[PDB]
Amino acid sequence: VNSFSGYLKLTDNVYIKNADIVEEAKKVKPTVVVNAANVYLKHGGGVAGALNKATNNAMQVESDDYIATNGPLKVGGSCVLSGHNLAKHCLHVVGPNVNKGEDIQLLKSAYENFNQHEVLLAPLLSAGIFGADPIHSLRVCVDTVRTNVYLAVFDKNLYDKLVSSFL
Ligand X SMILES: Nc1ncnc2ccccc12
**Distance from C-alpha of 91 to C-alpha of 35, rounded to nearest angstrom:** 6
Q: Are 106 and 140 in contact (CB under 8 A)?
A: no
Binding residue count for ligand X, defined by CB under 6 A: 8
Nearer to ligand X, 52 or 78 (CB): 52
Nearer to ligand X, 6 or 71 (CB): 6
| Binding of residue 16 to ligand X (CB under 6 A) | no
46 belongs to the binding site for ligand X (CB under 6 A): yes
Cβ-count burial of 166 within 10 angstroms (0-12 exposed, 13-18 middle, 19+ buried)? middle
128 binds ligand X (CB under 6 A): yes
Cα separation, 35 vs 121, in Å, equals: 9
Using the rule CB under 6 A, which residue among 39, 50, 59, 91 binds ligand X?
A: 50
| Binding residues for ligand X (CB under 6 A) | 20-22, 46-47, 50, 128, 154
